[PDB]
Amino acid sequence: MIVSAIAANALLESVTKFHCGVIYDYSTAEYVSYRPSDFGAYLDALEAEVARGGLIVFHNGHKYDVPALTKLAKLQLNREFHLPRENCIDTLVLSRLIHSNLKDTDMGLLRSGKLPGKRFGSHALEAWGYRLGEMKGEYKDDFKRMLEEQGEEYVDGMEWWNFNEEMMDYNVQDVVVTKALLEKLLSDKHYFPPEIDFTDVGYTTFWSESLEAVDIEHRAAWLLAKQERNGFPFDTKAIEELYVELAARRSELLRKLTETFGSNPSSRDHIQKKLQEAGWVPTKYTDKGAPVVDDEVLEGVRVDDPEKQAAIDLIKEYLMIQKRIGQSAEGDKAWLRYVAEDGKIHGSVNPNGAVTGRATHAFPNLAQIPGVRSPYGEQCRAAFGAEHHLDGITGKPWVQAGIDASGLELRCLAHFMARFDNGEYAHEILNGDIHTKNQIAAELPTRDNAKTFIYGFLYGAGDEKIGQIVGAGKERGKELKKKFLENTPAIAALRESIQQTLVESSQWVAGEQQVKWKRRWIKGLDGRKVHVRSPHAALNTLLQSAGALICKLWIIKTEEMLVEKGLKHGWDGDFAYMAWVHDEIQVGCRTEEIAQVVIETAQEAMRWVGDHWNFRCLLDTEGKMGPNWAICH
Amino acid sequence: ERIREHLSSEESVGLLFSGCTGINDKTLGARGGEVIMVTSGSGMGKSTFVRQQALQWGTAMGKKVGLAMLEESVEETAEDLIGLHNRVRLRQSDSLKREIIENGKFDQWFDELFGNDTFHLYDSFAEAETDRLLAKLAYMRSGLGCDVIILDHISIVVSASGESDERKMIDNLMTKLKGFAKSTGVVLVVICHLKNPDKGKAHEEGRPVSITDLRGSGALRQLSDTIIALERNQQGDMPNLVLVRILKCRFTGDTGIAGYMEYNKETGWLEPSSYSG
Amino acid sequence: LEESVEETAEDLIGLHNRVRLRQSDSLKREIIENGKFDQWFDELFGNDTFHLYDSFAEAETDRLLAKLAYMRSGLGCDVIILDHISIVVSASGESDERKMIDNLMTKLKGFAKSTGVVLVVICHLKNPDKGKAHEEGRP
Amino acid sequence: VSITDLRGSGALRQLSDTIIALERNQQGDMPNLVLVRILKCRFTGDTGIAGYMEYNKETGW
């Protein structure tokens, strides 16, 4: 196993030249520096570690280093350089896995003054250097101040323009931090046993003799990096074709909403000063004094003035128009600013910045696009589809396949409660109408009330919120929950074993529950440490971890089987991963025939995961074929 | 004809090992026909562990558990079960025994547990001859209709006395016990005891129990499908800490260390622990 | 002699379709909720080529050799498979089963050849306790 | 010694609820080391090695 980190001229989007790179080999216990005229030998040294059957350690390698050296080897040396996933390790990925929390631990490091506040909780290489005591300085700062003591000014992102011996020295500096952070991650005896040097071993022994979560996260991070490079095709004209229908409506409404109110329907310090003059008495306030002015209360605001009352719905539309504009046409997001020259949006994704499960998406958040049930969402969802590019060569309309996890949340509960009811509740899922059973069990009037109950009750809603479902308060809530526990004993006993797994005894002392903690981490499905939580609720943490870890393995096995079936991944191939959303995925497909294979494969892949972890409940998927996202869901 | 009938209605008696997950991850539990072998160092939790499952199975997932405690009267086993159900060391307290009786709290717990009419036991103690248990063990399974039969301590053979070495009695008994299990389709959990090694520190102070150190030429390593083993150093910093080790699993074949557990001196339960040596 | 005929077929069924039907509760559940048993089953055992032993309840020596002969002769089988041959259950009272297996092996060898069937039998291994044993290498 | 090695013709190994046994290597380098072994306890059924102890030869116990 060798440890490295590289230095290029810019990001992966427009990287042109390779500057330097250092390779520390543990068998020789000595570093090796590479220069612009040594890029060829650098690629050979990495291939040699692959030929021996070892491993290559990069920081942010799955997302940057490895794909950039594939791109850089194509334009500079014109060679096919491709690192296999199995022979690659990303310290950044393990850091987010092993140190998913840090929130706690970083507090003392912050109190110590050993961590910059700008580098709080960051998994960046420099952020970890201060944590381990290996930061002698940063290349960006020893460059800025040294440009002063030389003359020339500074450009926001110019320290990577040209190769200099100080970068070569700080390139080594990034490797020794990568090395020390790697060893800091290998010293956690819950993911890596106390065997031997896990550097000394080959990749075949590495993945299997390590905790399973280690392997999944590197397969997930490798897979998601491909999806970002694939990107999600974007119809610029269509979204532009939305802005006037919103902006003209915004301008026309603003005119009408200034004739009703003389001398901005967008701020809370505005309407509070205005609406409290038309006779509206705020019922619910906020923890800072100001009254609540959300969608809920506005629907119920009643004023004697007919014009003011009718103007409320015009404010309701205004805020929503601003919302769509504020998501589709604003500044520094808006999708329209993120459209790359290939007509696609490359939305980034953090493998699992959320302790339990489900990645985080940003620049732009591809997971918060308005659904087809929300206003103007039909047009918005239509703007996302594989139909925006009809094949990279053949001109063949690419069709989209959208596959989601059928009621994954409730099925995860049946598996963990199958420990107390012997597959009873799991069979009620298969029999169908689990919301009908929960309705009978909790004695609710309508099935829809049971649907919003089972999720609310499971996820820690108070007795008022439960009572407010049927139009009541905490009175009906307590009896609605107590009745459900009696009719479904397994759920109640489930919340016992959990409450007695992380607590020894609890006690209230002047405002704080003083739990005598037995463990501050629930074991997941792969064996990982899953957050710490704090109070009585925890079941929500267990279920969302199960489903997302199911989906993570699901989307990996799906792509693995599709590749195993011969289907090439990419826009120049048969399919391309475009988006992963919670329990659903959107996959571009070159032909309808291929799209059918994707749907069937996703269902078949769902069985390996369900079989692997011996899930007591049946995992299933449903696929929808069509041009865009408004059709596939 | 039988396979369609079996596979459609099959396990269906695959149960659910509680107290610690990981045992389920490597064994998926027991089948209707299999025989679970539970063992550990003398008095380290053999009786305690199996007693939790019988309770657990016979309460939450309404299964009919049959009990055959040959070293303790039926009254003592009920005492533990009653205390175990209500998370209390009902034995380990002269006050608690006196308590629940005078305020009428005994009948409360009693109806709560045995009310579903699930737990059934055998009274004998008088040596209990081999075909004076197997006949009755079948009577539960068949007459009372039990899904799981529990036989604590399998060194009390006592049958056809006059043949050198009871090394055959344990084998002959195990074969008849194993046979009975599948021909009726019952989950059979049996507890045995280990030989005293005297070749180093012995069991109660550490020492992993392999497959050879039990009886070596054992038949119980052959007839029994799954073998659960408990290890704990009661002379260490963690006497309550117990290691669970799968010694055999005909079903999965996945052996090794399952997980850990902690003996709650308050509830007498084996709550799952957090450990990785 | 150590698993139910439904389980042995279960292995055969899964093995035939290149799958781990046993280890998967989902795949068991899959093929049930659509009658897929009949599909794979008729594909496999439909040729009436497989015959097995069902009892568990103590197979005595000439209460096994009798039954093993029934296939060969009555059912017309060409291959007989005997799993685990440390299960004797016969003439208990003769110290050390080292003699029982010898008496058994000769009769098993006899029946096989005098009829011309193919007899495949599985035995186990003495635990050496003399080095690294079987599970960790050792020829 | 095995539970069978206990004295008598066989009433003390049967008619005895709790049987406490002490082991000490009164020749060699251990002697004063005493091991406590529970051979039987019908009242509990939990047998085995309890712990170790010995009050130094200076003052008995």
Swiss-Prot record, chain A:
Mg(2+) 4 binds at residues 404-405, 583. It catalyses: DNA(n) + a 2'-deoxyribonucleoside 5'-triphosphate = DNA(n+1) + diphosphate. Mg(2+) 1 binds at residue 5. The keyword Metal-binding applies. Coiled coil: none annotated. Keywords: DNA replication, DNA-binding, DNA-directed DNA polymerase, Exonuclease, Host-virus interaction, Hydrolase, Magnesium, Metal-binding, Multifunctional enzyme, Nuclease, Nucleotidyltransferase, Transferase, Viral DNA replication. One of its GO terms (molecular function) is DNA exonuclease activity. Substrate binds at residues 435, 447, 451, 455. Changing residue 123 to S: 83% loss of exonuclease activity. Residues 202-633 are annotated as: Polymerase. Its cofactor is Mg(2+). Residues 1-187 are annotated as: 3'-5'exonuclease. Mg(2+) 2 binds at residues 5, 7, 174. GO terms for biological process: DNA synthesis involved in DNA replication; DNA-templated DNA replication; double-strand break repair; viral DNA genome replication. Mg(2+) 3 binds at residues 404, 583. Its EC number is 2.7.7.7, 3.1.11.-. Belongs to the DNA polymerase type-A family. Composed of two subunits. One is encoded by the phage and the other is encoded by the host thioredoxin. Interacts with DNA primase/helicase; this interaction is essential for the coordination of DNA unwinding and nucleotide polymerization on duplex DNA. Interacts with the ssDNA-binding protein. Part of the replicase complex that includes the DNA polymerase, thioredoxin, the primase/helicase and the single-stranded DNA binding protein. Replicates viral genomic DNA. This polymerase possesses two enzymatic activities: DNA synthesis (polymerase) and an exonucleolytic activity that degrades single-stranded DNA in the 3'-5' direction. Non-processive DNA polymerase that achieves processivity by binding to host thioredoxin (TrxA). This interaction increases the rate of dNTP incorporation to yield a processivity of approximately 800 nucleotides (nt) per binding event. Interacts with DNA helicase gp4 to coordinate nucleotide polymerization with unwinding of the DNA. This is DNA-directed DNA polymerase. It comes from Escherichia phage T7 (Bacteriophage T7).
Swiss-Prot record, chain B:
Residues 9-276 form the SF4 helicase domain. It comes from the Viruses. ATP binds at residues 40-47. Homohexamer. Assembles as a hexamer onto linear or circular ssDNA in the presence of ATP or dTTP. Present in a mixture of heptamers and hexamers in the absence of DNA. Interacts (via C-terminus) with the viral DNA polymerase that is bound to DNA; this interaction is essential to initiate leading-strand DNA synthesis. The priming complex consists of 2 DNA polymerases and 1 helicase-primase hexamer that assemble on the DNA template. Interacts with the single-stranded DNA-binding protein. Belongs to the Teseptimavirus DNA helicase/primase family. The N-terminus zinc finger domain is essential for delivering the primed DNA template to the DNA polymerase. The central core domain contains the primase activity. The C-terminus region is responsible for the helicase activity and binds 1 Mg(2+)-dTTP. ATP-dependent DNA helicase and primase essential for viral DNA replication and recombination. The helicase moves 5' -> 3' on the lagging strand template, unwinding the DNA duplex ahead of the leading strand polymerase at the replication fork and generating ssDNA for both leading and lagging strand synthesis. ATP or dTTP hydrolysis propels each helicase domain to translocate 2 nt per step sequentially along DNA. Mediates strand transfer when a joint molecule is available and participates in recombinational DNA repair through its role in strand exchange. This is DNA helicase/primase. It comes from Escherichia phage T7. The chain holds residues 273 to 549 of 566 of the full protein.
Curated annotation (Swiss-Prot), chain C:
Transmembrane segments: none annotated. The keyword ATP-binding applies. Keywords: ATP-binding, DNA replication, DNA-binding, Helicase, Hydrolase, Magnesium, Metal-binding, Multifunctional enzyme, Nucleotide-binding, Nucleotidyltransferase, Primosome, Transferase, Viral DNA replication, Zinc, Zinc-finger. The record marks 20, 124 as: dTTP/dATP binding. GO terms for molecular function: 5'-3' DNA helicase activity; ATP binding; ATP hydrolysis activity; DNA helicase activity; DNA-directed RNA polymerase activity; identical protein binding; single-stranded DNA binding; zinc ion binding. GO terms for biological process: DNA replication, synthesis of primer; viral DNA genome replication. The keyword Signal does not apply. The N-terminus zinc finger domain is essential for delivering the primed DNA template to the DNA polymerase. The central core domain contains the primase activity. The C-terminus region is responsible for the helicase activity and binds 1 Mg(2+)-dTTP. Belongs to the Teseptimavirus DNA helicase/primase family. ATP-dependent DNA helicase and primase essential for viral DNA replication and recombination. The helicase moves 5' -> 3' on the lagging strand template, unwinding the DNA duplex ahead of the leading strand polymerase at the replication fork and generating ssDNA for both leading and lagging strand synthesis. ATP or dTTP hydrolysis propels each helicase domain to translocate 2 nt per step sequentially along DNA. Mediates strand transfer when a joint molecule is available and participates in recombinational DNA repair through its role in strand exchange. This is DNA helicase/primase. It comes from Escherichia phage T7.
